[PDB]
Amino acid sequence: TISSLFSRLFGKKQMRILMVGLDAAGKTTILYKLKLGEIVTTIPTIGFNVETVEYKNICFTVWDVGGQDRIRPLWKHYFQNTQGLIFVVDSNDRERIQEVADELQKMLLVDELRDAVLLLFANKQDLPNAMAISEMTDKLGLQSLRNRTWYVQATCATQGTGLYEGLDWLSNELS
Numbered sequence: 001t002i003s004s005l006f007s008r009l010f011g012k013k014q015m016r017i018l019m020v021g022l023d024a025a026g027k028t029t030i031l032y033k034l035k036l037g038e039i040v041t042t043i044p045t046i047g048f049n050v051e052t053v054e055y056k057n058i059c060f061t062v063w064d065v066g067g068q069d070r071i072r073p074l075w076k077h078y079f080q081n082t083q084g085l086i087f088v089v090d091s092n093d094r095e096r097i098q099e100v101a102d103e104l105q106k107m108l109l110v111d112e113l114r115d116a117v118l119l120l121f122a123n124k125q126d127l128p129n130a131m132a133i134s135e136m137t138d139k140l141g142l143q144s145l146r147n148r149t150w151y152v153q154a155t156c157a158t159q160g161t162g163l164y165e166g167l168d169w170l171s172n173e174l175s
C-alpha cells in the first residue's frame with residue numbers, strides 16, 4: 001500500500017524527499033520498509049554517507065545530522081527539487097533531544113528548503129520512556145512555525161506501524 005501513496009505523485013516531475021535525523025534514529029529501517037526498491041549507499045565526501053531509494057518518479061535521500069562537524073553542507077545538490085522533508089527522531093533518546101532541535105532548526109533555516117512540507121516521525125514509540133507526540137511537539141516548539149505546513153507522526157519503524165499514515169499525510173501534501 002505504501003507504493004500506492006506515491007502513485008498520486010507520479011506526475012512525471014522528478015521529486016526528492018529528504019529524510020534526515022541523528023544517527024540511529026531509524027532512517028535505514030524506514031527506507032527498507034518503504035518496499036519501493038533497493039537502498040543504495042554512496043559516500044560523496046569523507047564522513048558523508050548517503051542512502052538512496054529511487055522509486056520511479058520519486059527519490060529518497062537519507063543521511064545523518066550533527067555530532068561531527070557540518071564543515072561541508074555539500075548537501076546543496078540534493079536541495080534541488082526537495083518537496084518533502086522528513087525528520088526522524090528517536091523519541092526515547094531524551095539525552096540528544098537538544099541536538100535534534102538544533103539539527104531540525106538548521107534544516108529549517110536552509111533557504112532552498114523554505115517550501116518543503118515537513119513531516120516528523122516520532123519513532124520508537126515502543127520503548128519504555130518514549131516521548132508522546134504532544135510533548136515532542138512542545139519540547140521542539142514546532143508550534144512556533146507559522147508559515148510552514150508540518151505534521152508529527154508517532155511510529156515504530158521496526159514494526160512499520162505509523163509509517164504509512166505519516167507518508168499518507170505527506171504524500172497528500174505534495175500531490
Ligand SMILES: Nc1nc2c(ncn2[C@@H]2O[C@H](COP(=O)(O)OP(=O)(O)O)[C@@H](O)[C@H]2O)c(=O)[nH]1
Nearest residue numbers: 023024025026027028029123124155156157158
Ligand atoms: N525499538 C525500536 N527500535 C528501532 C525502531 N526503528 C529502528 N530501530 C532500531 O534502532 C536502531 C536505529 O538504526 P537505523 O534504523 O539504521 O537508524 P539510522 O542510523 O537513522 O539509519 C537500529 O538498531 C534499529 O533496529 C523502532 O521503531 N523501535
Ligand SMILES: [Mg+2]
Nearest residue numbers: 024027028051
Ligand atoms: Mg543510516
